[PDB]
mmCIF file of C-alpha atoms and ligand atoms in Angstrom:
data_model
loop_
_atom_site.group_PDB
_atom_site.id
_atom_site.type_symbol
_atom_site.label_atom_id
_atom_site.label_comp_id
_atom_site.label_asym_id
_atom_site.label_seq_id
_atom_site.Cartn_x
_atom_site.Cartn_y
_atom_site.Cartn_z
ATOM 1 C CA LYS W 1 1.528 -2.073 28.987
ATOM 2 C CA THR W 2 -0.785 -3.990 26.654
ATOM 3 C CA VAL W 3 -0.745 -2.372 23.238
ATOM 4 C CA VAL W 4 -4.231 -1.530 21.947
ATOM 5 C CA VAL W 5 -4.420 -2.333 18.243
ATOM 6 C CA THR W 6 -7.061 -0.620 16.137
ATOM 7 C CA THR W 7 -8.070 -2.507 13.019
ATOM 8 C CA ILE W 8 -11.015 -2.898 10.628
ATOM 9 C CA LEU W 9 -13.382 -5.745 9.680
ATOM 10 C CA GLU W 10 -12.301 -5.923 6.043
ATOM 11 C CA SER W 11 -11.845 -9.294 4.338
ATOM 12 C CA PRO W 12 -9.430 -11.047 4.247
ATOM 13 C CA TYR W 13 -7.442 -8.788 6.607
ATOM 14 C CA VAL W 14 -9.666 -9.223 9.683
ATOM 15 C CA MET W 15 -12.777 -11.394 9.893
ATOM 16 C CA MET W 16 -14.896 -12.875 12.663
ATOM 17 C CA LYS W 17 -14.036 -16.547 13.229
ATOM 18 C CA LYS W 18 -17.002 -18.853 12.593
ATOM 19 C CA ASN W 19 -17.137 -19.754 16.291
ATOM 20 C CA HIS W 20 -16.084 -16.345 17.677
ATOM 21 C CA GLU W 21 -18.877 -16.244 20.284
ATOM 22 C CA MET W 22 -17.157 -19.220 21.949
ATOM 23 C CA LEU W 23 -13.684 -17.605 21.911
ATOM 24 C CA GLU W 24 -12.064 -14.757 23.896
ATOM 25 C CA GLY W 25 -10.100 -11.642 22.962
ATOM 26 C CA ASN W 26 -7.674 -11.874 20.066
ATOM 27 C CA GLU W 27 -8.832 -15.436 19.361
ATOM 28 C CA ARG W 28 -12.190 -14.183 18.039
ATOM 29 C CA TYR W 29 -10.612 -12.939 14.810
ATOM 30 C CA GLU W 30 -8.657 -14.322 11.876
ATOM 31 C CA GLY W 31 -7.056 -12.929 8.730
ATOM 32 C CA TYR W 32 -3.928 -11.573 7.094
ATOM 33 C CA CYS W 33 -3.716 -8.642 9.581
ATOM 34 C CA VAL W 34 -4.516 -10.916 12.538
ATOM 35 C CA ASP W 35 -1.538 -13.087 11.495
ATOM 36 C CA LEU W 36 0.589 -9.978 10.904
ATOM 37 C CA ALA W 37 -0.333 -8.430 14.298
ATOM 38 C CA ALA W 38 0.780 -11.559 16.144
ATOM 39 C CA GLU W 39 4.112 -11.462 14.308
ATOM 40 C CA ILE W 40 4.735 -7.708 14.711
ATOM 41 C CA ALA W 41 3.960 -8.144 18.430
ATOM 42 C CA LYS W 42 6.411 -11.096 18.845
ATOM 43 C CA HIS W 43 9.213 -9.280 17.028
ATOM 44 C CA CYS W 44 8.674 -6.043 18.902
ATOM 45 C CA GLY W 45 8.198 -7.774 22.227
ATOM 46 C CA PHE W 46 4.768 -6.513 23.274
ATOM 47 C CA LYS W 47 1.393 -7.834 24.389
ATOM 48 C CA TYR W 48 -1.592 -6.493 22.502
ATOM 49 C CA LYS W 49 -5.338 -6.332 22.269
ATOM 50 C CA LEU W 50 -7.126 -6.256 18.897
ATOM 51 C CA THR W 51 -10.057 -3.825 18.724
ATOM 52 C CA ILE W 52 -12.284 -3.074 15.737
ATOM 53 C CA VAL W 53 -12.466 0.638 14.938
ATOM 54 C CA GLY W 54 -15.776 1.941 16.329
ATOM 55 C CA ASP W 55 -17.002 3.907 13.319
ATOM 56 C CA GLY W 56 -15.807 1.255 10.860
ATOM 57 C CA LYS W 57 -13.850 3.806 8.793
ATOM 58 C CA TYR W 58 -10.246 4.059 7.592
ATOM 59 C CA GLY W 59 -9.583 7.695 8.415
ATOM 60 C CA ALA W 60 -10.298 11.129 7.000
ATOM 61 C CA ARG W 61 -10.267 14.661 8.370
ATOM 62 C CA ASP W 62 -13.676 16.363 8.357
ATOM 63 C CA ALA W 63 -13.354 19.599 6.365
ATOM 64 C CA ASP W 64 -15.246 21.761 8.845
ATOM 65 C CA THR W 65 -14.956 20.187 12.318
ATOM 66 C CA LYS W 66 -11.335 19.247 11.429
ATOM 67 C CA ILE W 67 -11.772 16.040 13.411
ATOM 68 C CA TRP W 68 -10.127 12.819 12.219
ATOM 69 C CA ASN W 69 -12.353 9.750 12.047
ATOM 70 C CA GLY W 70 -11.666 6.018 11.574
ATOM 71 C CA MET W 71 -8.451 4.244 12.532
ATOM 72 C CA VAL W 72 -6.428 7.411 11.957
ATOM 73 C CA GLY W 73 -8.633 9.213 14.489
ATOM 74 C CA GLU W 74 -8.182 6.463 17.077
ATOM 75 C CA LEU W 75 -4.411 6.998 16.853
ATOM 76 C CA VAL W 76 -4.598 10.798 16.725
ATOM 77 C CA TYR W 77 -6.778 11.063 19.827
ATOM 78 C CA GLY W 78 -4.883 8.329 21.666
ATOM 79 C CA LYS W 79 -7.639 5.697 21.754
ATOM 80 C CA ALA W 80 -5.272 3.188 20.122
ATOM 81 C CA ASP W 81 -1.494 2.658 20.187
ATOM 82 C CA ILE W 82 -1.074 1.179 16.723
ATOM 83 C CA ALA W 83 -3.159 0.340 13.641
ATOM 84 C CA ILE W 84 -2.461 -2.928 11.821
ATOM 85 C CA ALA W 85 -4.844 -2.816 8.860
ATOM 86 C CA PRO W 86 -4.946 -2.204 5.067
ATOM 87 C CA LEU W 87 -4.368 1.507 5.855
ATOM 88 C CA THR W 88 -2.927 3.427 2.920
ATOM 89 C CA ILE W 89 0.179 5.571 3.442
ATOM 90 C CA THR W 90 -0.887 9.037 2.256
ATOM 91 C CA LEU W 91 0.617 12.514 2.604
ATOM 92 C CA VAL W 92 -2.283 13.924 4.651
ATOM 93 C CA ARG W 93 -2.107 11.028 7.076
ATOM 94 C CA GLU W 94 1.659 11.049 7.366
ATOM 95 C CA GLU W 95 1.390 14.664 8.527
ATOM 96 C CA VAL W 96 -0.491 13.545 11.660
ATOM 97 C CA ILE W 97 0.625 9.924 12.240
ATOM 98 C CA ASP W 98 3.705 7.762 11.601
ATOM 99 C CA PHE W 99 3.749 4.848 9.137
ATOM 100 C CA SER W 100 6.183 1.974 8.818
ATOM 101 C CA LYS W 101 7.573 1.255 5.356
ATOM 102 C CA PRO W 102 4.934 -0.625 3.265
ATOM 103 C CA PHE W 103 3.954 -4.197 4.179
ATOM 104 C CA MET W 104 1.872 -4.463 0.978
ATOM 105 C CA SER W 105 2.212 -2.702 -2.405
ATOM 106 C CA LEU W 106 -0.942 -1.835 -4.331
ATOM 107 C CA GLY W 107 -2.904 0.565 -6.508
ATOM 108 C CA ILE W 108 -6.459 1.674 -7.340
ATOM 109 C CA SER W 109 -8.164 -0.688 -9.781
ATOM 110 C CA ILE W 110 -11.513 -1.380 -11.440
ATOM 111 C CA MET W 111 -13.844 -4.192 -10.379
ATOM 112 C CA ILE W 112 -16.545 -5.234 -12.837
ATOM 113 C CA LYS W 113 -19.299 -7.843 -12.919
ATOM 114 C CA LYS W 114 -18.081 -10.394 -15.534
ATOM 115 C CA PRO W 115 -17.966 -3.903 -21.569
ATOM 116 C CA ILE W 116 -15.314 -1.881 -19.686
ATOM 117 C CA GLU W 117 -11.560 -2.346 -19.985
ATOM 118 C CA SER W 118 -10.189 0.823 -18.348
ATOM 119 C CA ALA W 119 -10.706 4.072 -16.451
ATOM 120 C CA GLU W 120 -10.749 5.878 -19.828
ATOM 121 C CA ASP W 121 -13.619 3.558 -20.809
ATOM 122 C CA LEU W 122 -15.610 4.420 -17.675
ATOM 123 C CA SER W 123 -15.033 8.152 -18.220
ATOM 124 C CA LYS W 124 -16.243 8.186 -21.846
ATOM 125 C CA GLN W 125 -19.582 6.552 -21.021
ATOM 126 C CA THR W 126 -22.637 6.904 -18.806
ATOM 127 C CA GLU W 127 -24.714 3.697 -18.939
ATOM 128 C CA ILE W 128 -22.447 2.022 -16.373
ATOM 129 C CA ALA W 129 -22.337 3.847 -13.025
ATOM 130 C CA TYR W 130 -19.174 3.745 -10.899
ATOM 131 C CA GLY W 131 -18.003 4.827 -7.480
ATOM 132 C CA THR W 132 -15.603 4.365 -4.576
ATOM 133 C CA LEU W 133 -15.541 3.718 -0.814
ATOM 134 C CA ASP W 134 -17.312 6.803 0.668
ATOM 135 C CA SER W 135 -14.384 7.548 2.936
ATOM 136 C CA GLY W 136 -10.815 6.655 2.056
ATOM 137 C CA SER W 137 -7.693 7.165 -0.015
ATOM 138 C CA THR W 138 -9.423 6.108 -3.231
ATOM 139 C CA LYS W 139 -12.077 8.851 -2.994
ATOM 140 C CA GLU W 140 -9.300 11.354 -2.227
ATOM 141 C CA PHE W 141 -7.222 10.179 -5.190
ATOM 142 C CA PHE W 142 -10.094 11.210 -7.489
ATOM 143 C CA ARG W 143 -11.095 14.408 -5.657
ATOM 144 C CA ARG W 144 -7.557 15.736 -6.141
ATOM 145 C CA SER W 145 -6.363 14.259 -9.454
ATOM 146 C CA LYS W 146 -5.316 16.863 -12.001
ATOM 147 C CA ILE W 147 -5.169 14.112 -14.649
ATOM 148 C CA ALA W 148 -7.905 14.588 -17.275
ATOM 149 C CA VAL W 149 -9.504 11.129 -17.230
ATOM 150 C CA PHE W 150 -9.606 10.968 -13.424
ATOM 151 C CA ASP W 151 -10.892 14.562 -13.075
ATOM 152 C CA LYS W 152 -13.687 13.678 -15.519
ATOM 153 C CA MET W 153 -14.494 10.582 -13.437
ATOM 154 C CA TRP W 154 -14.549 12.641 -10.214
ATOM 155 C CA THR W 155 -16.795 15.336 -11.757
ATOM 156 C CA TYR W 156 -19.281 12.571 -12.536
ATOM 157 C CA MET W 157 -18.986 10.585 -9.297
ATOM 158 C CA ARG W 158 -19.329 13.539 -6.945
ATOM 159 C CA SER W 159 -22.599 14.609 -8.609
ATOM 160 C CA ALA W 160 -24.158 11.227 -9.463
ATOM 161 C CA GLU W 161 -27.571 10.584 -7.893
ATOM 162 C CA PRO W 162 -28.302 8.269 -6.313
ATOM 163 C CA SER W 163 -24.867 8.208 -4.649
ATOM 164 C CA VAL W 164 -22.256 6.004 -6.232
ATOM 165 C CA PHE W 165 -20.258 5.914 -2.968
ATOM 166 C CA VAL W 166 -20.490 3.034 -0.475
ATOM 167 C CA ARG W 167 -19.910 2.701 3.299
ATOM 168 C CA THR W 168 -17.845 -0.488 3.169
ATOM 169 C CA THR W 169 -15.964 -2.552 0.610
ATOM 170 C CA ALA W 170 -18.502 -5.399 1.005
ATOM 171 C CA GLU W 171 -21.250 -2.938 0.068
ATOM 172 C CA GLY W 172 -19.413 -1.971 -3.128
ATOM 173 C CA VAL W 173 -18.871 -5.620 -4.018
ATOM 174 C CA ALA W 174 -22.562 -6.466 -3.495
ATOM 175 C CA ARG W 175 -23.641 -3.477 -5.604
ATOM 176 C CA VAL W 176 -21.382 -4.681 -8.429
ATOM 177 C CA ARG W 177 -22.804 -8.211 -8.052
ATOM 178 C CA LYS W 178 -26.471 -7.186 -8.083
ATOM 179 C CA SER W 179 -26.313 -4.471 -10.771
ATOM 180 C CA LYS W 180 -26.280 -6.658 -13.908
ATOM 181 C CA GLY W 181 -23.123 -4.930 -15.143
ATOM 182 C CA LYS W 182 -24.541 -1.415 -14.612
ATOM 183 C CA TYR W 183 -22.178 -0.642 -11.687
ATOM 184 C CA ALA W 184 -18.363 -0.858 -11.651
ATOM 185 C CA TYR W 185 -16.420 -0.312 -8.438
ATOM 186 C CA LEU W 186 -13.106 1.493 -7.916
ATOM 187 C CA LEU W 187 -11.068 -0.091 -5.108
ATOM 188 C CA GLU W 188 -7.543 -1.123 -4.177
ATOM 189 C CA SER W 189 -6.052 -3.935 -6.278
ATOM 190 C CA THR W 190 -5.529 -6.031 -3.133
ATOM 191 C CA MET W 191 -9.262 -6.149 -2.264
ATOM 192 C CA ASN W 192 -10.131 -6.585 -5.959
ATOM 193 C CA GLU W 193 -7.773 -9.604 -6.342
ATOM 194 C CA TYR W 194 -9.182 -11.171 -3.198
ATOM 195 C CA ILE W 195 -12.843 -10.882 -4.273
ATOM 196 C CA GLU W 196 -11.949 -12.244 -7.716
ATOM 197 C CA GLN W 197 -11.067 -15.525 -5.931
ATOM 198 C CA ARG W 198 -14.343 -15.670 -3.982
ATOM 199 C CA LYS W 199 -17.627 -17.395 -4.881
ATOM 200 C CA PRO W 200 -19.767 -16.785 -6.883
ATOM 201 C CA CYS W 201 -16.675 -15.883 -8.994
ATOM 202 C CA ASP W 202 -18.703 -13.276 -10.856
ATOM 203 C CA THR W 203 -16.343 -10.313 -10.534
ATOM 204 C CA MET W 204 -13.102 -9.426 -12.192
ATOM 205 C CA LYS W 205 -10.291 -6.931 -11.978
ATOM 206 C CA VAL W 206 -9.881 -5.047 -15.354
ATOM 207 C CA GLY W 207 -7.066 -2.860 -16.641
ATOM 208 C CA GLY W 208 -3.859 -1.819 -14.935
ATOM 209 C CA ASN W 209 -3.588 -0.047 -11.620
ATOM 210 C CA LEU W 210 -4.313 3.697 -11.650
ATOM 211 C CA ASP W 211 -1.502 4.459 -9.179
ATOM 212 C CA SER W 212 1.158 2.829 -6.987
ATOM 213 C CA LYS W 213 1.265 3.019 -3.200
ATOM 214 C CA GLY W 214 1.413 0.956 -0.046
ATOM 215 C CA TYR W 215 -0.204 -0.002 3.238
ATOM 216 C CA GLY W 216 1.744 0.782 6.378
ATOM 217 C CA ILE W 217 1.527 -0.042 10.098
ATOM 218 C CA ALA W 218 0.563 3.246 11.769
ATOM 219 C CA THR W 219 1.433 4.635 15.201
ATOM 220 C CA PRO W 220 0.720 7.992 16.920
ATOM 221 C CA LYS W 221 3.189 10.695 15.942
ATOM 222 C CA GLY W 222 6.273 10.269 18.114
ATOM 223 C CA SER W 223 5.288 6.841 19.480
ATOM 224 C CA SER W 224 7.840 4.671 21.278
ATOM 225 C CA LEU W 225 6.824 1.726 19.019
ATOM 226 C CA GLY W 226 7.509 3.251 15.589
ATOM 227 C CA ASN W 227 11.169 2.307 15.149
ATOM 228 C CA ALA W 228 10.788 -1.343 16.158
ATOM 229 C CA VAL W 229 7.566 -1.794 14.219
ATOM 230 C CA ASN W 230 9.262 -0.465 11.079
ATOM 231 C CA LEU W 231 12.251 -2.761 11.521
ATOM 232 C CA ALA W 232 9.884 -5.700 12.059
ATOM 233 C CA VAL W 233 7.991 -4.975 8.811
ATOM 234 C CA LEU W 234 11.302 -4.831 6.896
ATOM 235 C CA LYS W 235 12.518 -8.060 8.500
ATOM 236 C CA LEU W 236 9.251 -9.949 7.845
ATOM 237 C CA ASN W 237 9.225 -8.795 4.216
ATOM 238 C CA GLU W 238 12.838 -9.816 3.617
ATOM 239 C CA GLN W 239 12.216 -13.208 5.144
ATOM 240 C CA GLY W 240 9.246 -13.807 2.869
ATOM 241 C CA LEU W 241 6.521 -13.914 5.536
ATOM 242 C CA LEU W 242 4.465 -11.116 3.942
ATOM 243 C CA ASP W 243 4.328 -12.925 0.574
ATOM 244 C CA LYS W 244 3.491 -16.164 2.405
ATOM 245 C CA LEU W 245 0.583 -14.461 4.217
ATOM 246 C CA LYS W 246 -0.827 -12.913 1.059
ATOM 247 C CA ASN W 247 -0.733 -16.316 -0.660
ATOM 248 C CA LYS W 248 -2.377 -17.935 2.361
ATOM 249 C CA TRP W 249 -5.302 -15.484 2.508
ATOM 250 C CA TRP W 250 -5.763 -14.667 -1.195
ATOM 251 C CA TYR W 251 -4.871 -17.754 -3.221
ATOM 252 C CA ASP W 252 -4.309 -20.909 -1.117
ATOM 253 C CA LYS W 253 -7.912 -20.665 0.042
ATOM 254 C CA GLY W 254 -9.249 -19.325 -3.278
ATOM 255 C CA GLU W 255 -12.746 -20.576 -4.248
ATOM 256 C CA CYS W 256 -12.600 -20.095 -8.043
ATOM 257 C CA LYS P 1 28.641 1.066 -5.379
ATOM 258 C CA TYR P 2 25.173 1.062 -3.828
ATOM 259 C CA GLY P 3 26.322 0.095 -0.356
ATOM 260 C CA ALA P 4 27.243 -2.920 1.723
ATOM 261 C CA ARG P 5 29.013 -3.447 5.045
ATOM 262 C CA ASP P 6 32.378 -5.227 5.090
ATOM 263 C CA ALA P 7 32.007 -8.293 7.387
ATOM 264 C CA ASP P 8 35.532 -7.719 8.751
ATOM 265 C CA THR P 9 35.954 -3.971 9.270
ATOM 266 C CA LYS P 10 32.227 -3.257 9.608
ATOM 267 C CA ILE P 11 32.862 -0.268 7.303
ATOM 268 C CA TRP P 12 30.110 0.778 4.857
ATOM 269 C CA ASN P 13 30.891 1.419 1.181
ATOM 270 C CA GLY P 14 28.916 2.944 -1.683
ATOM 271 C CA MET P 15 26.325 5.678 -1.360
ATOM 272 C CA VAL P 16 25.370 4.268 2.040
ATOM 273 C CA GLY P 17 28.943 4.731 3.281
ATOM 274 C CA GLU P 18 29.034 8.289 1.945
ATOM 275 C CA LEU P 19 25.968 9.130 4.042
ATOM 276 C CA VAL P 20 27.215 7.221 7.092
ATOM 277 C CA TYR P 21 30.576 8.973 7.125
ATOM 278 C CA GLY P 22 29.162 12.374 6.185
ATOM 279 C CA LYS P 23 30.631 12.716 2.674
ATOM 280 C CA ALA P 24 27.139 13.335 1.222
ATOM 281 C CA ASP P 25 23.951 14.817 2.698
ATOM 282 C CA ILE P 26 21.370 12.813 0.797
ATOM 283 C CA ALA P 27 21.282 9.957 -1.706
ATOM 284 C CA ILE P 28 18.808 10.306 -4.567
ATOM 285 C CA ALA P 29 19.243 7.046 -6.480
ATOM 286 C CA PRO P 30 17.649 3.580 -7.069
ATOM 287 C CA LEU P 31 18.713 2.685 -3.503
ATOM 288 C CA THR P 32 16.738 -0.206 -2.064
ATOM 289 C CA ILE P 33 15.140 0.134 1.355
ATOM 290 C CA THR P 34 16.518 -2.701 3.493
ATOM 291 C CA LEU P 35 16.711 -3.667 7.178
ATOM 292 C CA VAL P 36 20.541 -3.527 7.425
ATOM 293 C CA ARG P 37 20.618 -0.092 5.812
ATOM 294 C CA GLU P 38 17.626 1.227 7.789
ATOM 295 C CA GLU P 39 19.711 0.567 10.905
ATOM 296 C CA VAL P 40 22.411 3.081 9.842
ATOM 297 C CA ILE P 41 20.608 5.598 7.589
ATOM 298 C CA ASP P 42 17.088 6.948 7.128
ATOM 299 C CA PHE P 43 14.894 6.244 4.093
ATOM 300 C CA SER P 44 11.873 8.181 2.830
ATOM 301 C CA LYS P 45 8.731 6.245 1.868
ATOM 302 C CA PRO P 46 9.335 4.535 -1.505
ATOM 303 C CA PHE P 47 9.345 6.599 -4.689
ATOM 304 C CA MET P 48 9.376 3.387 -6.752
ATOM 305 C CA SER P 49 8.161 -0.203 -6.267
ATOM 306 C CA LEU P 50 10.152 -3.167 -7.602
ATOM 307 C CA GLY P 51 11.400 -6.705 -7.125
ATOM 308 C CA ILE P 52 14.312 -8.990 -8.067
ATOM 309 C CA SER P 53 13.890 -10.521 -11.545
ATOM 310 C CA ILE P 54 15.723 -12.601 -14.129
ATOM 311 C CA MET P 55 17.279 -11.216 -17.290
ATOM 312 C CA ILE P 56 18.017 -13.695 -20.082
ATOM 313 C CA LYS P 57 19.372 -13.463 -23.591
ATOM 314 C CA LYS P 58 16.445 -14.096 -25.928
ATOM 315 C CA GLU E 1 15.798 -5.463 -10.126
ATOM 316 C CA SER E 2 12.699 -5.490 -12.349
ATOM 317 C CA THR E 3 13.116 -1.745 -12.921
ATOM 318 C CA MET E 4 16.549 -2.019 -14.579
ATOM 319 C CA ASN E 5 15.436 -5.237 -16.309
ATOM 320 C CA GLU E 6 12.348 -3.768 -18.024
ATOM 321 C CA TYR E 7 14.318 -0.656 -19.029
ATOM 322 C CA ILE E 8 17.014 -2.707 -20.764
ATOM 323 C CA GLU E 9 14.314 -4.872 -22.339
ATOM 324 C CA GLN E 10 13.138 -1.778 -24.267
ATOM 325 C CA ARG E 11 16.555 -0.800 -25.607
ATOM 326 C CA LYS E 12 18.627 -1.815 -28.629
ATOM 327 C CA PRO E 13 19.834 -4.305 -29.607
ATOM 328 C CA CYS E 14 16.533 -5.575 -28.077
ATOM 329 C CA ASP E 15 18.151 -8.946 -27.348
ATOM 330 C CA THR E 16 17.268 -9.452 -23.685
ATOM 331 C CA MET E 17 14.096 -10.061 -21.751
ATOM 332 C CA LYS E 18 12.671 -10.373 -18.253
ATOM 333 C CA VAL E 19 11.322 -13.865 -17.480
ATOM 334 C CA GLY E 20 9.106 -15.033 -14.653
ATOM 335 C CA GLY E 21 7.606 -12.909 -11.921
ATOM 336 C CA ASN E 22 9.482 -10.847 -9.360
ATOM 337 C CA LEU E 23 11.131 -12.803 -6.532
ATOM 338 C CA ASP E 24 10.171 -10.181 -3.921
ATOM 339 C CA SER E 25 8.409 -6.794 -3.490
ATOM 340 C CA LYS E 26 10.310 -3.777 -2.216
ATOM 341 C CA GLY E 27 11.017 -0.156 -2.923
ATOM 342 C CA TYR E 28 13.613 2.500 -3.523
ATOM 343 C CA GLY E 29 13.911 5.343 -1.031
ATOM 344 C CA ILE E 30 15.685 8.713 -0.812
ATOM 345 C CA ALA E 31 18.219 8.244 1.985
ATOM 346 C CA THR E 32 19.673 10.665 4.512
ATOM 347 C CA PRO E 33 22.101 10.275 7.411
ATOM 348 C CA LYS E 34 20.523 9.445 10.766
ATOM 349 C CA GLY E 35 19.253 12.639 12.404
ATOM 350 C CA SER E 36 19.373 14.654 9.192
ATOM 351 C CA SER E 37 17.502 17.961 9.153
ATOM 352 C CA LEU E 38 16.291 17.019 5.624
ATOM 353 C CA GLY E 39 14.731 13.643 6.470
ATOM 354 C CA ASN E 40 11.268 14.817 7.440
ATOM 355 C CA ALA E 41 10.771 17.170 4.505
ATOM 356 C CA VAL E 42 12.127 14.806 1.834
ATOM 357 C CA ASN E 43 9.792 12.082 3.050
ATOM 358 C CA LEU E 44 6.745 14.344 2.752
ATOM 359 C CA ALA E 45 7.997 15.549 -0.639
ATOM 360 C CA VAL E 46 8.160 11.954 -1.926
ATOM 361 C CA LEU E 47 4.557 11.436 -0.770
ATOM 362 C CA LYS E 48 3.453 14.659 -2.505
ATOM 363 C CA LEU E 49 5.133 13.759 -5.809
ATOM 364 C CA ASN E 50 3.560 10.302 -5.871
ATOM 365 C CA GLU E 51 0.106 11.728 -5.252
ATOM 366 C CA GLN E 52 0.496 14.536 -7.840
ATOM 367 C CA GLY E 53 1.185 11.771 -10.324
ATOM 368 C CA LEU E 54 4.695 13.151 -10.940
ATOM 369 C CA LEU E 55 6.476 9.878 -10.103
ATOM 370 C CA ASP E 56 4.371 7.962 -12.631
ATOM 371 C CA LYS E 57 5.007 10.701 -15.168
ATOM 372 C CA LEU E 58 8.796 10.455 -14.748
ATOM 373 C CA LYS E 59 8.587 6.657 -14.918
ATOM 374 C CA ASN E 60 6.771 6.735 -18.284
ATOM 375 C CA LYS E 61 9.134 9.435 -19.510
ATOM 376 C CA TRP E 62 12.317 7.419 -18.848
ATOM 377 C CA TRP E 63 11.048 3.881 -19.500
ATOM 378 C CA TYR E 64 8.140 3.931 -21.986
HETATM 379 N N1 QUS T 1 -6.972 1.499 2.290
HETATM 380 C C1 QUS T 1 -7.902 2.640 2.016
HETATM 381 C C2 QUS T 1 -9.401 2.381 2.219
HETATM 382 N N2 QUS T 1 -10.049 2.063 0.933
HETATM 383 O O1 QUS T 1 -10.012 0.702 0.476
HETATM 384 C C3 QUS T 1 -10.192 0.770 -0.882
HETATM 385 O O2 QUS T 1 -10.211 -0.222 -1.573
HETATM 386 N N3 QUS T 1 -10.326 2.080 -1.218
HETATM 387 C C4 QUS T 1 -10.238 2.895 -0.140
HETATM 388 O O3 QUS T 1 -10.298 4.079 -0.068
HETATM 389 C C5 QUS T 1 -7.542 3.689 3.076
HETATM 390 O O4 QUS T 1 -6.615 3.455 3.860
HETATM 391 O O5 QUS T 1 -8.201 4.741 3.086
#
């Protein structure tokens, strides 16, 4: 009956409300995806329960145990009925789960502490270290690129010691902030743009996006919800709600 | 034409109509994914991102 | 659409230009009739091409 929604504590998509300990259920959270979940649920006619993914990961298949972790795993093993999060539509995921059309368009980008202007720049040097989220579509983009500059970047990143990979986006952001310009972070343009509008306003997005892709609402392969969820995403985009929500969470409340 | 539904006859024209009435098996073109179309035909994930814009003479 | 606009902007007589930002954000998709045997495979093929970098390659080829 009640749809279990798996999501991730990733700002500004889902965050704990300042007074969450005094609130119950869905009311404990706020964010772009919290606002989107309420709307998808109204338009699809279902009751839901927001739950934060237990391992705090997006979703990758372990080469070895072949088990899917993160939000993708929760859907694959039936622990959740739908994922409403900044989950990237990728070929490997689409093979095991269904995705609505994109609710947000984006691409990999470079985040620097306020002398690097591009991925080519990062590749040609070694003083400034750089990495990605330890588990996610960004790390996979590099591990599989056949493009020279990106393959060179991957060769470096995968062998860098200490590790240049981070467990969460917040961790990558803090590393950039505390490294005196000696660490650049590769992350999705959406997260980059958000952080650029957050105090202490010491980071910046540089260069163009490395690729073009989108985030989609995910459901277990063959779910009853897929069709309606997809139609809802298309309707909300055409009406302008998605743009409204991005403005609300990225720029209207910007601190810089 | 790309494809729109006649308000009167409810008949689809353009590439959309060709798919709807079985004249073509697939449309590979700059065909925009929309709610009205998604109701009558299937669309793959996007191969290109875009938005409406304004073209002016310099 | 921004796509046609920016293409024309880079073609003689070079007398037009795109002004302002896009009014919305959407995408183009390969379409098939409802229940088509091709639907599933074409969708996965689009995802493969984007990830291989082929779509960006074709875009630069025909625009830039
Ligand atoms: N949305 C990404 C997670 N992730 O966020 C980034 O900024 N990079 C990255 O891999 C995914 O779905 O795997």
